[PDB]
Design a protein around this ligand. Sequence first.
Ligand code: FUM
Ligand code: MN
Ligand code: ZN
Length: 444
Amino acid sequence: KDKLNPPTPSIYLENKRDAFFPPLHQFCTNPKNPVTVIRGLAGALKLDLGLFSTKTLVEANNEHMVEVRTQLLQPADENWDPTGTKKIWRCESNRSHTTIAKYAQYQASSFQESLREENEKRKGPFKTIKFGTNIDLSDNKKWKLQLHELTKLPAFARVVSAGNLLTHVGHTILGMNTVQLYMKVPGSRTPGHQENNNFCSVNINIGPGDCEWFVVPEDYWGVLNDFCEKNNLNFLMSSWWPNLEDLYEANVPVYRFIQRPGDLVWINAGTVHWVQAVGWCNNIAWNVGPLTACQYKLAVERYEWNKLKSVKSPVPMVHLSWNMARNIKVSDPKLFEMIKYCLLKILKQYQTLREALVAAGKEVIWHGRTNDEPAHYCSICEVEVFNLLFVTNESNTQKTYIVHCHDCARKTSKSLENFVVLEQYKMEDLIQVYDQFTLALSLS
Ligand SMILES: O=C(O)/C=C/C(=O)O
Ligand SMILES: [Mn+2]
Ligand SMILES: [Zn+2]
C-alpha cells in the first residue's frame, strides 16, 4: 500500500515570522501528525549552529563525558546478524565512555580516512563504528552560550517555557528538561524507542551531514512491542532496529525522511522512531510536554505501563499532576477531566493507606518538605512514592531519609516495625488543592 509509505508532515520556514506563526505550533501538537519536520528552522531564526560544532565543543569543555555506543556500520535501512545471513531486530550496541576531545579526534580522523578510501578507487562482514551519544549539556556555567542560543526558538519548542509540562515538574529531569548532545559518524544509530513517558521531543541537526529518520505512529506501538517479544527483546530496554519488511508485512505505516542541518524534527507524543547518521554531524535534543489531553494521557499510560515492566519513569507523574493542579489554569475540558480523575485516585489511595496505618497503631510522622524538592522514588523498586514515605528507623535517626514504598517496606518488615512513616503533605492541604482545581474558561 502507498499508505504504508505516507508523506512526511513537513513545513519549510523562510523567516522569523514563519517560525512564530501560531499555526506552526498547532500543527506539531496535533495528534494526527506523528512527526513534523520543520525545514529551514535554524536559517529562519538565524540560529548559530556553529555554537554546537565539534570544534567549538572541544574548545568549551574538552574533558566532558561522552557515552560511546560501539556499533556495526549497516547498509541503508537494514540490520543483519553479524554473519550476514539474515535480517534481525537485535542491534550490536556496546557501551563505554570517552571525552568530547577524544571523540572529536575520532570523528575527524573518520572523515579524513573515508576521503582517502574514496581516492583509493576500486551480507557483510561489517565494520565497527563509534557513536557519541547522550552528552549532558545541563550545566549553564559550562554551556552558557549554547543554551542561550536555544532561547531564540519559538516558545513551544524551547527547553523551558510556561506552557511546557516538564517546566512545571519543578526540578531537573536530566536529558528531558535539559539538552542532550549527539556527535556522529556515518551509520551512527539511535535504535527504536519511544520517549521517556511518551513526552514529545525536539531534535536539531547541527550538520554538516544529514540524518535519516524512521517514524511509526503511536497507535501502532503494540505491534512493535509484539515483534520485540517474539524476537526475545525488551521493547523498552533492548537495542533493536526494525525490519522494514516485517513492518510492511504487518501493515504498519512507516514515515521515512531526511533531516538536514538546521532542520528541526518534532516527535509527537508516543511516536516510535529510530535514526541513523548519513554523514558526519552533530545533533541536539530534548523533550517538551504540550498541555494537551493527548500528551497527558499518553504520559500517564506509559507511567503505568512502566510499573508493570519494572522500569523506572523519569517523569514523576504524581508529583507533576499536583503541580499542574496547584499552578496551571486548565481550560480544555478533556484534559481537565483527566487530571481531576488522577488526583481523585491518588487522594483515595493515600487516604486508604493512611487509615490502614492509623488503624494498625502505626504513627504517621509530620515531615513536611523543602520547596523545589524533587519527587521521591523507592530505593528498591524505583516506583514513585508520593507523600507517605517509608524510612527505616536507622535512616530516620541518621537523617538520611532513604525512601521506600509501602510494599517494599512491608516485604522487608512484616508489621513495619523497622520503619517510620513520614508525611510530606497534610491531607487538608491536598483536599484543598483538589477542591480548588476547577475548569478555567477560555474562548480559544
Ligand atoms: O540520534 C539522534 O540524533 C537522535 C535520536 C532521537 O532524538 O531520538
Ligand atoms: Mn528520541
Ligand atoms: Zn518499592
